[PDB]
Every structure is written in C-alpha cells, then in structure tokens.
C-alpha cells in the first residue's frame, strides 16, 4: 500500500444542490474531499441533507468538516460495502491524505502502528491535583 493522490477531475454524484454545503471556511481555512469507487449506480443519502445518485465508477464529493466525511464513510461502508478515503485540502492546494492513514482501516490491528496517548497504569493510579499545581498552564493529573 502507498498513499494515493487526489484527482480533482473525478466526476461527482448527481445532486441538485443543497443549502447545507460549503461556506467561507472552505475558501479561507480548509475543506475535505471524499473519494470512492462504486460498483453500480445507486441512490445514497447526503450527510448535509437530501438524496443523491452515485455514479458507476469513481465518485467525488467535498464537505466542510471531518464528521461529515466520517458519516458518509460509515454509510457507504456499512450499507453499500464500499471502501472510501477522504482527504484534507487547503486553499494553498496542499492535499493531506487520511482515513485509512495506514491503508488498513483503524478498526483492526495492523503491525507498524505506534501507540500514542497510552498511560501504562490504571485510572485510579493517577496523582492528586495538588501534585500538579503551578505548572505553566491548567493541567489534569492524567496528563503526566
């Protein structure tokens, strides 16, 4: 598995145009672009409201936040048995692939993933908040 590239010249699903699409965040900060390949022409549900027809082959939608792409991914993955991937696009043109960032979906173990944010103790083995007073910021005892 290698990291795929975004094709901006990918045909979009058939959709008449909602009022719940992109805003100035897509022009100033970022927007996300979801890509999948379908087996047949079939109606799905747009996460911003409404119905849309996916094409037969490569499809392409663009959303504002990340949870919209996760909701469409969960729909296309549990209802249609499809394998989508969605990227992060900046107004510079910088394209950031993710999900599945390893190429294998995160709901199953893959050798090579480094464990992050793992406290190697119980939650009852944390210190008291007196022990973390007067650091450079507000801290929770589970941060250390």
């Amino acid at each position: 598995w290698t990291v795929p590239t975004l094709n901006p010249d990918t045909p979009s699903p058939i959709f008449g145009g909602s009022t719940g699409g992109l805003l100035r965040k897509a022009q100033t900060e970022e927007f996300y672009v979801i890509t999948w390949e379908a087996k047949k022409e079939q109606i799905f549900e747009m996460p911003t409201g409404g119905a849309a027809i996916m094409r037969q082959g490569p499809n392409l939608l663009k959303f504002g936040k990340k949870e919209q792409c996760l909701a469409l991914t969960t729909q296309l993955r549990n209802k249609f048995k499809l394998t989508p991937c969605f990227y992060r696009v900046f107004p510079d043109g910088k394209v950031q692939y993710l999900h599945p960032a390893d190429g294998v979906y995160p709901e199953k173990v893959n050798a090579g993933r480094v464990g992050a944010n793992q406290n190697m103790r119980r939650i009852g083995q944390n210190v008291n908040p007196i022990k973390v007073k007067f650091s450079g910021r507000m801290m929770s005892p589970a941060e250390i």
Partner: protein, 118 residues
C-alpha cells in the same frame, strides 16, 4: 453543488448588484462612502422627524429629527472606523476602509443637511 433560485442567479439581479455602489471595483472608497452616506442619511432623516419626541411642536420637529439623524450618522461612522480597525490589521484594506468611513461621515451629514434644506 449550490441550490439554484431565480433570486440568486437572475441576470437582472446580477446587473443591479453590479450597479450598486458597493460593487463597482474601480471607483474610490471615498466616492463609495459619500454615495452610500448621501443615500442613508437622506433616508434616515425621516422617521426621527415624523415620530420623535418633538414631533408635535412646530418648526422644531424637523430640526430635532435632523439633529438626531446627524448624531446617528456620527455613531455609524464611529462603528465603521472601529470595524476597520478590527478587521484589517481597495475597499478591503485599512487605509481604504478609513477613507470609506470618512466618506460615509461626510456623505451622511450632507444627506441629512439636504433632507433638512427641504
């Protein structure tokens, strides 16, 4: 995609919006300010005169209404100036918005003075 409506995508609407003075893209911010002020002060002078607290006293209703309209135009120019000081740190610049706010002050006071001279 974006929803299609006659209201957002009509050619007469596009020409009217391109002809209104906030859109011409090549006229001066001072000129945009004085035209917008001459419109808005002239319309704002009305309801203060007709419904203000001195509306039933002769010869002073129009004076008090135009004076309150000039005060509100001054408040609006202060609002434009602090909006520019917050937002920008040709119309969408610090110097351009300060020019636009000064033009709105001048045009609004001129519009109130022309709505009185009536």
């Amino acid at each position: 995609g974006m929803l299609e409506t006659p209201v957002t995508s009509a050619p007469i609407v596009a020409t009217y919006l391109s002809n209104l003075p906030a859109y011409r893209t090549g006229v001066a911010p001072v000129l945009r300010g004085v035209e917008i002020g001459l419109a808005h002060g002239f319309l704002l002078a009305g309801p203060f005169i007709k419904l203000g607290p001195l509306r039933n006293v002769p010869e002073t209703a129009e004076i008090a209404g135009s004076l309150s309209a000039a005060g509100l135009v001054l408040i609006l120019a202060l609002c434009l100036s602090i909006y520019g000081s917050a937002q920008f740190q040709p119309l969408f610049s610090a110097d351009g918005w300060s020019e636009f706010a000064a033009g709105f002050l001048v045009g609004g006071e001129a519009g109130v003075a022309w709505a009185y001279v009536c």
